[PDB]
From TrEMBL:
Protein name per UniProt: CO-methylating acetyl-CoA synthase
Highest taxon above the source species: Bacteria
EC number(s) recorded for this UniProt protein: 2.3.1.169
Keywords: 4Fe-4S, Iron, Iron-sulfur, Metal-binding, Nickel, Oxidoreductase, Transferase, Zinc
A Pfam family that the UniProt record links to this protein: ACS_CODH_B_C
Gene field: acsB
Family annotation (InterPro entries): ACS_CODH_B_C, CO_DH/Ac-CoA_synth_bsu, CO_DH/Ac-CoA_synth_bsu_3_sf, CODH_A_N, Prismane-like_a/b-sand, Prismane-like_sf
Domain CO dehydrogenase/acetyl-CoA synthase complex beta subunit C-terminal positions: 484-728
Enzyme class: transferase
One GO term of the biological process aspect: acetyl-CoA metabolic process
Binding site for Zn(2+): 508, 594, 596
GO-annotated molecular function: 4 iron, 4 sulfur cluster binding; anaerobic carbon-monoxide dehydrogenase activity; CO-methylating acetyl-CoA synthase activity; metal ion binding
Positions annotated to bind [4Fe-4S] cluster: 505, 508, 517, 527
Length: 728
C-alpha cells in the first residue's frame, strides 16, 4: 500500500509552488507553537495526569487515533505526540514536506480543541446550537446510512469567508440541493445566518465554529474509517486510503488566505481531499488537482465536484423550493405553517396503485379541489394523494414499497413536511414555501419525477392526483383502506418458517466491506429500514442489486438458527472472515454490524440477562459503557459474541433472540426506548405469558446505571430472567 502514489504527477521537479509550500511551513510551525504553549500552560495548571478529551466519542482524539493510534486520555499523553509532529515539519520546500506539515497542523488543531474542551461540561457548554464544535459519534452513525448509498454524494468543508453573504447563500443552497454534507468554519457561518439559511445537525450542515474548530471536520471524517470500516487505530495509510476512496470530501477555501488556514487545507490534501479557493492564484501557489483557484462563484461548486469526482443526479423539474436530504429533518412550527392536511385535523390518505395500460396518461398531475391559496395562513384542507402506476414489469407487491417512498419524497422539499402513512398521514407546508410559489401541483410533479427517477425499470407511466374536497377524500379513503387491508393480510402470512428464502443486504459494504446483513421475515435489518418484503422487492426490481435471495437449506442448528446456505453466502460475501451465523442468538456466532444499528444489546452475566441501548440515549448503561463506546466494539463487521446490533422493531419480533430466551431475558432498556415500543412489548409479553405488565419489570436509567443499583430492583420485581439459566 503506497498511498502517496496518488500525488505522483501533481508537481514535476523544479516548478514546486514555493509560495504555497512556504506559507504551509509557516502555518504549521505557528499551529504547533500555539498548541505547545497552550499544552504547557494547561499541564502547569491542571497537572500532567488531568483527563482530556471530547464529549461522546469512542475514539479519544480521532485524528490521532486514526493516523497514529495513540489512546490520548490525559494531557501528558499529548506531549510526545506534539513533539513528534513538530519534528516532522521541515524547511525544504517539497510537496511531501508540505503534506507532513499539514498532518502536523491537523494534530495541533486536534490538541488545541481537546484543550478547549477541558472547560466543557454538558451543563457549562462551550458551544451552543446551531453550532456543533466537536460532533459526537451518534451523529456520524445517524448519517452513515445516507452516506453508504450516496444519498449524501460527498462532503464540502468550507472555511473562511464568502465574498459576501449573498454569494455564501447561493453556493450553500446549491450544495444543500445536491445533498452534500457541509462542514462550515469561520465567518461563512454568520454570513449564512444573516441570510436565514437553515443550519445545524438536523440539516446536515454543521457550523463547527472558527479557527481550529475546522479540525472537527477531520475527526468526523476519520471516524468513518474507525467505525464502519473497522480499520485498526494507527494504520495511517489504510485510513488515508479509506478517506480517499470513500469519503468524497473537498475543501472550499474562501476569502483572504492566512498561513494557518493554508496549512489546515494542506492537511486535507495530505489525506486526499482537494482544495478549491475563490482567490486568484499565481502559478507558484497552486497544485494541479489539489490546490486550485476558481474565482467565479458561478463555477466553484461544479469545479470542486468535478475535481473530487462527485457525480450528482438531479430530477431537473423547476421546483420553486429547494429540495434535498438536508430538509428531511426540518420541522415546521405552527407560526411558520401556511397550511396542513391530515394529522387528525382534516381527512387524509396516500396510495400507490398499479394500473393497466388503458388507464393512465404519463406525467399527468391534477389537483381536484381548492389549492392551498384557498386558505388563510395557518389553515387546513383535506388531502388524498393517488399515484397510479402502470409498468410492464410492475407488480402489485411493489405498491406498498413505492408508497413508503412518498414520505421521504415529501420531506426532502424545503418547507414540505410529512409524517405517518396510509390514512394517518400528516402533511404541512410552510409560509416560506408558499411565498416562493409552491402549490399542490408542485408536490405532485415532485412525486412524479422522483418515482420516475427511482424506479425506471418498473414504472413506464405514472400519474398523480391530489383531491382536496372533504367528502370525496372521505369516499376515496375507503378504497385506500381496502388496499391497506389486503397488504396487512399478505404481511400476516409471513414467518421465518413459512418462507423458504431469506435475503442478503450488502448496501453497507461501500463503507463496511466485511459486513453482511441477512433479513428474514421476523428479523428486520439492523438499520431498521429494510424488511424482508423490502429486500425481496428490491431484488425483484434489480436482480443484480445488493439484495439477493438465499434459500433456507443445509440446516445445522434449528434452535440457534444456523444453515449451511447462509453460512456459505456470508463467508463468500464477508471476504472469508465470517464463517458462521446463528440467527436466534447473540451469544454464539452473532450476525455482524456495520455501524448504523438503531440499538445495541449486550449480555450482562451479573443480571443474568440483556441490556439494550438505542443510539439516541445519552447516559451510562449497566455494562459500564455508553452507546458510543459499545458501538465502537459492536460495529466494524467483526463477530462479537455477547453483543449485537439490531433494529428497534426487532425487539417486538416473535423470533427476537429466541434461542436466548427472547423478551423474557431483557432486564434493562432506556425509559424512552421502552415507551417507544410499549405497545408491541405489551402484546408480545402477553403472548409469551409474561403478562402485559412485564414492561414494568424491565429496569431503566431511572432505576440505575450500574449492576449494583439494578439487581435489587429485578429481585424485588421477581424478574423471570433471574430464575432462567445463565446464558454463558
Ligand atoms: S439491511 Fe443491513 S446492510 Fe442493508 S442498509 Fe440496513 S444495515 Fe445496511
Ligand atoms: Cl513553552
Ligand atoms: Cl497514549
Ligand atoms: Ni451500520
Amino acid at each position: 500500500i503506497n498511498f502517496d502514489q496518488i500525488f505522483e504527477g501533481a508537481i514535476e521537479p523544479g516548478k514546486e509552488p514555493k509560495r504555497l509550500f512556504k506559507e504551509v511551513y509557516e502555518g504549521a510551525i505557528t499551529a504547533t507553537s500555539y498548541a505547545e504553549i497552550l499544552l504547557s500552560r494547561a499541564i502547569e495548571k491542571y497537572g500532567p495526569d488531568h483527563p482530556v478529551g471530547y464529549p461522546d466519542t469512542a475514539y479519544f482524539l480521532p485524528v490521532i487515533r486514526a493516523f497514529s493510534g495513540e489512546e490520548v486520555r490525559t494531557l501528558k499523553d499529548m506531549v510526545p505526540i506534539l513533539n513528534r509532529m513538530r519534528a516532522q515539519i521541515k524547511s525544504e520546500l517539497t510537496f511531501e514536506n508540505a503534506r507532513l506539515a499539514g498532518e502536523a497542523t491537523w494534530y495541533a488543531a486536534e490538541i488545541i480543541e481537546a484543550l478547549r474542551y477541558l472547560k466543557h461540561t454538558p451543563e457549562n457548554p462551550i458551544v451552543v446550537p446551531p453550532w456543533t464544535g466537536f460532533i459526537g459519534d451518534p451523529v456520524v452513525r445517524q448519517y452513515g446510512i445516507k452516506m453508504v448509498d450516496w444519498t449524501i454524494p460527498g462532503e464540502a468543508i468550507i472555511i473562511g469567508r464568502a465574498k459576501d453573504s449573498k454569494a455564501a447563500k447561493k453556493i450553500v443552497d446549491d450544495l444543500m440541493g445536491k445533498g452534500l454534507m457541509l462542514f462550515l468554519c469561520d465567518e461563512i457561518i454568520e454570513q449564512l445566518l444573516e441570510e436565514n439559511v437553515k443550519l445545524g445537525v438536523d440539516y446536515i450542515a454543521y457550523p463547527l465554529g472558527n479557527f481550529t474548530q475546522v479540525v472537527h471536520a477531520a475527526n468526523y471524517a476519520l471516524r468513518a474509517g474507525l467505525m464502519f470500516g473497522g480499520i485498526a487505530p494507527g494504520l495511517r495509510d489504510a485510513h488515508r486510503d479509506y478517506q480517499r476512496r470513500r469519503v468524497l470530501a473537498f475543501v472550499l477555501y474562501l476569502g483572504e488566505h492566512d498561513m494557518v488556514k493554508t496549512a489546515a487545507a494542506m492537511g486535507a490534501i495530505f489525506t486526499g481531499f482537494p482544495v478549491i479557493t475563490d482567490q486568484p492564484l499565481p502559478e507558484d501557489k497552486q497544485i494541479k488537482d489539489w490546490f486550485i483557484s476558481e474565482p467565479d462563484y458561478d463555477k466553484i461548486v461544479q469545479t470542486a465536484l468535478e475535481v473530487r469526482g462527485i457525480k450528482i443526479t438531479s430530477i431537473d423539474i423547476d421546483l420553486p423550493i429547494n429540495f434535498g436530504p438536508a430538509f428531511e429533518g426540518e420541522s415546521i412550527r405552527k407560526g411558520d405553517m401556511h397550511v396542513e392536511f391530515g394529522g387528525g385535523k382534516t381527512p387524509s390518505f396516500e396510495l400507490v396503485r398499479m394500473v393497466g395500460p388503458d388507464e393512465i396518461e404519463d406525467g399527468k398531475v391534477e389537483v381536484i379541489g381548492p389549492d392551498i391559496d384557498s386558505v388563510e395562513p395557518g389553515g387546513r384542507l383535506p388531502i388524498g394523494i393517488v399515484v397510479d402506476i402502470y409498468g410492464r414489469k410492475m407488480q402489485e407487491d411493489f405498491e406498498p414499497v413505492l408508497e413508503r417512498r412518498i414520505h421521504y419524497f415529501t420531506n426532502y422539499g424545503e418547507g414540505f413536511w410529512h409524517t405517518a402513512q396510509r390514512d394517518l398521514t400528516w402533511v404541512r407546508i410552510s409560509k416560506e414555501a408558499f411565498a416562493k410559489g409552491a402549490r399542490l401541483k408542485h408536490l405532485g410533479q415532485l412525486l412524479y419525477a422522483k418515482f420516475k427517477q427511482e424506479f425506471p425499470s418498473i414504472v413506464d407511466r405514472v400519474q398523480v392526483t391530489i383531491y382536496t374536497d372533504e367528502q370525496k377524500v372521505l369516499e376515496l379513503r375507503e378504497i385506500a383502506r381496502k388496499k391497506y387491508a389486503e397488504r396487512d393480510a399478505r404481511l400476516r402470512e409471513l414467518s421465518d418458517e413459512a418462507v423458504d428464502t431469506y435475503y442478503s443486504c450488502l448496501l453497507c459494504q461501500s463503507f463496511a466491506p466485511t459486513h453482511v446483513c441477512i433479513v428474514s421475515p421476523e428479523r428486520v435489518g439492523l438499520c431498521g429500514a429494510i424488511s424482508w418484503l423490502d429486500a425481496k422487492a428490491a431484488y425483484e426490481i434489480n436482480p443484480n442489486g445488493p439484495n439477493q435471495p438465499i434459500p433456507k437449506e443445509g440446516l445445522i442448528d434449528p434452535v440457534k438458527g444456523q444453515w449451511e446456505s447462509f453460512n456459505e453466502y456470508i463467508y463468500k460475501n464477508s471476504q472469508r472472515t465470517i464463517e458462521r451465523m446463528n440467527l436466534y442468538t447473540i451469544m454464539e456466532y452473532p450476525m455482524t454490524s456495520c455501524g448504523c444499528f438503531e440499538a445495541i444489546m449486550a449480555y450482562l452475566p451479573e443480571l443474568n440477562g440483556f441490556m439494550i441501548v438505542n443510539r439516541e440515549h445519552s447516559g451510562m448503561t449497566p455494562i459500564g459503557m455508553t452507546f458510543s463506546t459499545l458501538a465502537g466494539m459492536v460495529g466494524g463487521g467483526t463477530q462479537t459474541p455477547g453483543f449485537m446490533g439490531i433494529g428497534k422493531s426487532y425487539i417486538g419480533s416473535r423470533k427476537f433472540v429466541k434461542a436466548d430466551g427472547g423478551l423474557a431475558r431483557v432486564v434493562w432498556m432506556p425509559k424512552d426506548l421502552k415507551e417507544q415500543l410499549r405497545s408491541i412489548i405489551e402484546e408480545r409479553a402477553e403472548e409469551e405469558g409474561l403478562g402485559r405488565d412485564f414492561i414494568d419489570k424491565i429496569a431503566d436509567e431511572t432505576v440505575g446505571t450500574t449492576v449494583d443499583e439494578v439487581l435489587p430492583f429485578l429481585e424485588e420485581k421477581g424478574h423471570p430472567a433471574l430464575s432462567m439459566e445463565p446464558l454463558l
